[PDB]
Design a protein around this ligand. Structure first.
Ligand code: HEM
Ligand SMILES: [Mg+2]
Length: 90
């Protein structure tokens, strides 16, 4: 019922738990990225990620205007999709 076996799903209330330097997950465009090993290598700094860790950071991501290389760089951190219950209705 909407459920691709190829896709692990994470509820947002779970993603919210990963908001620490020990484990930082973040949501971008309906997708969940584990950025823990990425923190120190993010050119915009750790702080800006930490401040939005455990949440949907899509808007902030897009407003900064990340580069194509930045988008390509994010893919290795993809660990699953946001549970459909927690996606916008429209
Ligand atoms: C939504 C949370 C995020 C925020 C708030 C954020 C914010 C920023 C800011 C403020 C800068 C500096 C502005 C500038 O370059 O002039 C920056 C640069 C950069 N960010 Fe992020 N970033 C986020 C997520 C990510 C992710 C997931 C990746 C990919 C793994 C990433 C990759 C980069 C790269 C490569 C740069 C260097 C410039 C470019 O290639 O765009 N960022 N980021
Ligand atoms: Mg490329």
């Amino acid at each position: 019922q909407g459920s691709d076996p190829a896709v692990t799903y994470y509820r947002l209330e779970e993603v919210a738990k990963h908001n620490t330097s020990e484990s930082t997950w973040m949501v971008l465009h309906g997708r969940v990225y584990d950025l823990t090993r990425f923190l120190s290598e993010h050119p915009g700094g750790e702080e800006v990620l930490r401040e939005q860790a455990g949440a949907d950071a899509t808007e902030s991501f897009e407003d900064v205007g990340h580069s194509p290389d930045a988008r390509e760089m994010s893919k290795q951190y993809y660990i699953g999709d946001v549970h459909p219950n927690d996606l916008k209705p429209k």
